Amino acid sequence: IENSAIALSGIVSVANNADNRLEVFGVSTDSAVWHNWQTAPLPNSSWAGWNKFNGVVTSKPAVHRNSDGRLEVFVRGTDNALWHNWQTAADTNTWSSWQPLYGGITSNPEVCLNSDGRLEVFVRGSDNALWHIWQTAAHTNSWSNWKSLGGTLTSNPAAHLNADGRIEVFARGADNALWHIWQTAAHTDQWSNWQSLKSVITSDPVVINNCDGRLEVFARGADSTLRHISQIGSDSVSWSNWQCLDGVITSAPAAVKNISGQLEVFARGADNTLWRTWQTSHNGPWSNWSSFTGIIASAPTVAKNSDGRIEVFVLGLDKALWHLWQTTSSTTSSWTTWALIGGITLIDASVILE
Amino acid sequence: IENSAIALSGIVSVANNADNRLEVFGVSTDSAVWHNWQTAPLPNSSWAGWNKFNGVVTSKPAVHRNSDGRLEVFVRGTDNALWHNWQTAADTNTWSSWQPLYGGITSNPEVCLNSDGRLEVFVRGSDNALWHIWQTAAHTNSWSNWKSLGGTLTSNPAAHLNADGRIEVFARGADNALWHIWQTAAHTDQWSNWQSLKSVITSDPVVINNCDGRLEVFARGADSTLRHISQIGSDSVSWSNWQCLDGVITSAPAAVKNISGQLEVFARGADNTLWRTWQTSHNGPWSNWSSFTGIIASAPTVAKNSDGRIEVFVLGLDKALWHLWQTTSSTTSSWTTWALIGGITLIDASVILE
Amino acid sequence: IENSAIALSGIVSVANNADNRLEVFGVSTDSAVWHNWQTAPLPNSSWAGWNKFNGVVTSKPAVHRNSDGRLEVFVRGTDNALWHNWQTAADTNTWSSWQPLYGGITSNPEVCLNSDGRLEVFVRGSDNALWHIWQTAAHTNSWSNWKSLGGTLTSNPAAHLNADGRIEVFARGADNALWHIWQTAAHTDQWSNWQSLKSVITSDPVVINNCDGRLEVFARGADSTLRHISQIGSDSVSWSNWQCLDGVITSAPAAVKNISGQLEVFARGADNTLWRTWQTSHNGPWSNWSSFTGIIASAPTVAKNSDGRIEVFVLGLDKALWHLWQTTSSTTSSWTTWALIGGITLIDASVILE
Amino acid sequence: IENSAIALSGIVSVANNADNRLEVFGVSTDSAVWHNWQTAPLPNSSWAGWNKFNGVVTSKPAVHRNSDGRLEVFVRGTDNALWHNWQTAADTNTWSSWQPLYGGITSNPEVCLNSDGRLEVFVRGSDNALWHIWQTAAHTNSWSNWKSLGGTLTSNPAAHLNADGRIEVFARGADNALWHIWQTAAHTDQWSNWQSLKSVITSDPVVINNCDGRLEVFARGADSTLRHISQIGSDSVSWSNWQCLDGVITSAPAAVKNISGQLEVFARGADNTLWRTWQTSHNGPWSNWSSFTGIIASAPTVAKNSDGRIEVFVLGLDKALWHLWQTTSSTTSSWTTWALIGGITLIDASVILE
Numbered sequence A, B, C, D: 001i002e003n004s005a006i007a008l009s010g011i012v013s014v015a016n017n018a019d020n021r022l023e024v025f026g027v028s029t030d031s032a033v034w035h036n037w038q039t040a041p042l043p044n045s046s047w048a049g050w051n052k053f054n055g056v057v058t059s060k061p062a063v064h065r066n067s068d069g070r071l072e073v074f075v076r077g078t079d080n081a082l083w084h085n086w087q088t089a090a091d092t093n094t095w096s097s098w099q100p101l102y103g104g105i106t107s108n109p110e111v112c113l114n115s116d117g118r119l120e121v122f123v124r125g126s127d128n129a130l131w132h133i134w135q136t137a138a139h140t141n142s143w144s145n146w147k148s149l150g151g152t153l154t155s156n157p158a159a160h161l162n163a164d165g166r167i168e169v170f171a172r173g174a175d176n177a178l179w180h181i182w183q184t185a186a187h188t189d190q191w192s193n194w195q196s197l198k199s200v201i202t203s204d205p206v207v208i209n210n211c212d213g214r215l216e217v218f219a220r221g222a223d224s225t226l227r228h229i230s231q232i233g234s235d236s237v238s239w240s241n242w243q244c245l246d247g248v249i250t251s252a253p254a255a256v257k258n259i260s261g262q263l264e265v266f267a268r269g270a271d272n273t274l275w276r277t278w279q280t281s282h283n284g285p286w287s288n289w290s291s292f293t294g295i296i297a298s299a300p301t302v303a304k305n306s307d308g309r310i311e312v313f314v315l316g317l318d319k320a321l322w323h324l325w326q327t328t329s330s331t332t333s334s335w336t337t338w339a340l341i342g343g344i345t346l347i348d349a350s351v352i353l354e
């Protein structure tokens, strides 16, 4: 791989409804967003079937749950502007249809929920800078004007809350290194300058919080192995050294915190199967990668069910959506084999950043 | 103290709104529930002022946020039945007024949110057994019939979710020991038998989860010191030995998990001031109790703001509500002094269990 | 029990030879010290048989290994002075016989090894103060003059090295509380003032270091349960609160660090059997006490074999020495039943402190 | 670098005497071993001056302390056989002079102390296999015959005790991967088969134990960065994945456990200065490398003083020995600058393995 490569992304975005039922969003061969949902919040539940949102889109959809429980989806439109669509009530399959937020978008959208209940969207703009827009009141369809945070982005952005409620945003920069920028006060439009975390990355950054509040960032490195870095203090400026883990991965990673508070990472491996690694103890060393049977055609997307069981979604070689899950709510649970969520085929609508 | 004593409880119940603004509920000298809320989700925010719900009540109110963000309050009425009252929309100060759930109640109500989004209420019934009633659909005003879980209760119940979504309920039994009972499958009406955790307790039990998922229970013991016990496995049957901490406390304890994932406990101390202890490291040893200036007349009620800062509410000697909070989002932050939330005086409406 | 009680002590002192074979020292009905040793450094080894040191003694013997591997035993003599006896070469059953160190002794002797290789002995003196004497060169029979550290002692002293090489000494004071005093520079005659750790204790203090260097002190409390306190900083002045563990114990405790770095405590329980508790995780909560079959007549003395297996020694109801041990080098190993080390009967020669 | 490279080694071997004074052994321009020692066991002590052992040697010397406190040095002689030399009494500068152990040696010698007090020496033999020889009684000049453990070695061996007393030996194999072999019972001549840990290494392996007993192995990898792997169970067959740390190193690493139980690693960095990294928490993430002023010409050799302070030895550009140390017994202590231990110049006598 080259230093400027961006690893294969996940094929769907997933969210938990207010009642924790999983719901997935993807783009089909008609270039429309389709979605499907569990009928009950357990991994062995039946799924409702694929339902279409009318409208042609030009990016991967991003989904987040509002602070009042309503799902809301963000996508780039045929006019290269930002559009969004929301449930009109929590746990209800009635949606608003696509509404305009304007702007000029050159990446997939990334959504965060501020700790005061307001959604905030981050995108690469037409000048390759980071731009953002936010709800001006919690869970309300009232949005700010577009505002620039500067920088030069060469990946999609990834945002996450710090334990103290400050949003922090990660993105690859013009030098192919990981850069970040952060709110200096919780849920306020007051931001730091851009700072580099060094090290080249060859995937979008993936961010998760560990139980003790500190952010941990995962990405594929220049040698195509997983690497990670973590906060070591109580602010956004104190980080560990980068560490890599042996094993060539061929997609973006996906990280999740399991029931016991330990981190797990899933990625497509060098043999194009799903690979999994987990922390063996608190902050502990990482296990050897374990492989699941079956060739996959996307990065994994990982979610948790209402009983804590982890569930993984991938594109199959038939271009359909497949999933598998843990049989029990336990870190050492066995796993099912891949099962089909049939009815449509999916395309990778990710914005080509070049 | 005697083995059957129940320590002084907190004077208000508190919840975070959908936008994380704190809102407090207490009973005034007119025997009505009054509430007050932050106007913005920060501890130094102004408060809106005390507002009355019409209706005479006969217990401490219990409050929980629905899975769609709406607060809902539960109380015993003048007919000794259960009544409830809800926000009609998230973050909105429009309420339904008191509606009947019937039953015959002989304790304060305790509310939990199942991991499938349904509220569930636990009470001691007219036969001194544990009874419960639940929403039959998430965040919907449709409730089950009353059902008995048996047992003999001599305290109020305390409920908490396990990491795998199973509700577990704790209560003092006829022998003054701590007993518990639990769902054997997440958010399902399938329950274990009652089991004893031994050790006498002289307060209601207080339950919190630690970062690695395991429940930890705090209570005052027969010698009036704080004691605690924790789960050591991945089920509800494997517990540690009881440990006590030196220092006589004169109220129920209140526990909170701070920004760094460590536990903190607040209680009224032997000198009738607020005392605080915290874990010095992960699962680590506990600090000596630290005292805050000022005599208090209730147990503390503890909450967290949108930026992680801890805030504590108590009854003052003037019978009004006072609070103090951390100045910064840091475990070693200094604290403010007591400030008044003036406008009404409060009474302890806790059901007398004798 | 009364506040000034001192719990039953162990009946033998034990040490590892230079080759890690265990060797035990006790006092028989002739008031002489006898010793016995493993013939190979494994718990299932045969023992050599009981051998007598000529000389009448008036205290429990204390044993320590010199920095050149030679065992050295300290005891009070019929003249109430301190006497000692050493192996003339490591792993050799040739001894010097008793030699005088003079002084006037009113407790059992306690021995430490400084981190510069010099033995140092701590005793209560004729004025009830703490006195000490030391080797002036490592592993050499050249000793200092007696020197007082002041204080008023009502238990035997317990000494231990801090991680930075400073000796710290613990003893019960005139108010029945635990007091301590420490070197302010490693292996130097420069000492702090006495400071109180508060809390009454009803046994000698027992001190051990945890893997991260910090000292942890165990003792029986006024209510006859085990209590413990630990250092929380990098100095001798920062300590946690006291914690107790449920369960009445009827002897001094004995603490050991197992193969996995966790602490274990053994004591005679309320039913006069051997009880064991262990930390379930790093610094973690403590297990319920587990009981071994068999009534015992002393506190346990606990040692570790060359392969890490824990071995426990007690006085039986026949007044002989019995032991049991772990079957495998594993924290969850099963244990053998009590086996006799026959040939003599033993008496408790502990100095009566009253 | 190439896959078969072996990084620059340390220029001296170091040991603590029975009284913990440091003593260093190196080879001078006369091809003889010289040694020097602290006069007192503190890093700011004066050193005695360089003293010569008569005899020409052809490897780096290895030193270990016997279980009776006497230092013993092992070296290859002009006849390519193993020779050794010992203190005739602990903490005494009287030595036996070189005595033969015969054999045919093609690596530097590696020494371990079994948990039953017997030294054991590991070498690559004339057939490139691992060979060993041992004391047949603790701290006695009585040795076994030479015995082969097979394998094919392309680095020097590194040996360490497991927590249960089993020796485990690590060495690079014919495929440039790290291999290991272990005793299956403590201090017994019963050994496993060779097993591969995979991953290429470009330095000798460096092994240390962490506080919870588990071995951790450090080495330079094929991309010239530090990598490490650790045991995750209670046996020698369960290991983590390999992890690397960013930063090019140009020598073998040296690892030490600090006063607080955390690991630290020192190595010559890409700019030929001394670099240091440490674990920021238990098992925690690793700090960015920190650099010390001054160009160095060997790997570091790291030791601990009697008060816990870390001290580092290196070859300077003047071909003399320099050292620096911590100013206080604290993990965050500042460090001195390089100071000269003058009197001889040193050569790297490491056996050329090619």
Ligand SMILES: C[C@@H]1O[C@H](O)[C@@H](O)[C@H](O)[C@@H]1O
Pocket: A054, A055, A056, A057, A076, A077, A078, A079, A083, A098
């Ligand atoms: C998502 C939106 O759907 C509509 O049908 C289109 O007209 C807009 O351009 C946009 O693509």
Ligand SMILES: C[C@@H]1O[C@H](O)[C@@H](O)[C@H](O)[C@@H]1O
Pocket: A102, A103, A104, A105, A123, A124, A125, A126, A127, A131, A146
């Ligand atoms: C998101 C922002 O929207 C605006 O319309 C553009 O002018 C900016 O370049 C950026 O794309």
Ligand SMILES: C[C@@H]1O[C@H](O)[C@@H](O)[C@H](O)[C@@H]1O
Pocket: A150, A151, A152, A153, A172, A173, A174, A175, A179, A194
């Ligand atoms: C995000 C950062 O913004 C800056 O403008 C650039 O100089 C860096 O290379 C990076 O692109």
Ligand SMILES: C[C@@H]1O[C@H](O)[C@@H](O)[C@H](O)[C@@H]1O
Pocket: A293, A294, A295, A296, A314, A315, A316, A317, A318, A322, A338
């Ligand atoms: C991930 C899925 O695994 C299955 O074995 C295949 O049959 C599907 O095509 C898909 O690749």
Ligand SMILES: C[C@@H]1O[C@H](O)[C@@H](O)[C@H](O)[C@@H]1O
Pocket: B054, B055, B056, B057, B076, B077, B078, B079, B083, B098
């Ligand atoms: C809370 C309810 O308020 C009403 O006013 C009363 O009539 C009911 O009995 C009940 O107390």
Ligand SMILES: C[C@@H]1O[C@H](O)[C@@H](O)[C@H](O)[C@@H]1O
Pocket: B102, B103, B104, B105, B123, B124, B125, B126, B127, B131, B146
């Ligand atoms: C809560 C339950 O409501 C019912 O009406 C009563 O009959 C039961 O005893 C119990 O009080």
Ligand SMILES: C[C@@H]1O[C@H](O)[C@@H](O)[C@H](O)[C@@H]1O
Pocket: B150, B151, B152, B153, B172, B173, B174, B175, B179, B194
């Ligand atoms: C809750 C428990 O229920 C049982 O019926 C009683 O026997 C116990 O004492 C306790 O009250």
Ligand SMILES: C[C@@H]1O[C@H](O)[C@@H](O)[C@H](O)[C@@H]1O
Pocket: B293, B294, B295, B296, B314, B315, B316, B317, B318, B322, B338
């Ligand atoms: C808790 C409050 O502290 C203050 O100092 C007092 O003035 C109030 O009456 C109340 O006791």
Ligand SMILES: C[C@@H]1O[C@H](O)[C@@H](O)[C@H](O)[C@@H]1O
Pocket: C054, C055, C056, C057, C076, C077, C078, C079, C083, C098
């Ligand atoms: C231990 C010593 O043994 C000797 O036999 C006695 O004479 C001394 O008084 C002392 O008791």
Ligand SMILES: C[C@@H]1O[C@H](O)[C@@H](O)[C@H](O)[C@@H]1O
Pocket: C102, C103, C104, C105, C123, C124, C125, C126, C127, C131, C146
């Ligand atoms: C150990 C000391 O020895 C001396 O001889 C006595 O005078 C002191 O009181 C103390 O007993």
Ligand SMILES: C[C@@H]1O[C@H](O)[C@@H](O)[C@H](O)[C@@H]1O
Pocket: C150, C151, C152, C153, C172, C173, C174, C175, C179, C194
């Ligand atoms: C050891 C301490 O020494 C002091 O003299 C006493 O005042 C304390 O009570 C305690 O005995």
Ligand SMILES: C[C@@H]1O[C@H](O)[C@@H](O)[C@H](O)[C@@H]1O
Pocket: C293, C294, C295, C296, C314, C315, C316, C317, C318, C322, C338
């Ligand atoms: C500890 C030993 O346990 C055995 O069962 C007894 O027979 C001995 O007398 C002794 O009490």
Ligand SMILES: C[C@@H]1O[C@H](O)[C@@H](O)[C@H](O)[C@@H]1O
Pocket: D054, D055, D056, D057, D076, D077, D078, D079, D083, D098
């Ligand atoms: C170390 C030994 O020193 C002696 O002088 C030599 O004769 C031997 O060959 C060997 O080198």
Ligand SMILES: C[C@@H]1O[C@H](O)[C@@H](O)[C@H](O)[C@@H]1O
Pocket: D102, D103, D104, D105, D123, D124, D125, D126, D127, D131, D146
């Ligand atoms: C160490 C061993 O010594 C023996 O003499 C040789 O024959 C072997 O090959 C090996 O070198």
Ligand SMILES: C[C@@H]1O[C@H](O)[C@@H](O)[C@H](O)[C@@H]1O
Pocket: D150, D151, D152, D153, D172, D173, D174, D175, D179, D194
């Ligand atoms: C140490 C190991 O021994 C075996 O013989 C070899 O096959 C491996 O490559 C490695 O050298």
Ligand SMILES: C[C@@H]1O[C@H](O)[C@@H](O)[C@H](O)[C@@H]1O
Pocket: D293, D294, D295, D296, D314, D315, D316, D317, D318, D322, D338
């Ligand atoms: C390590 C030492 O650092 C010093 O600055 C130099 O002067 C010496 O030559 C040597 O390189």
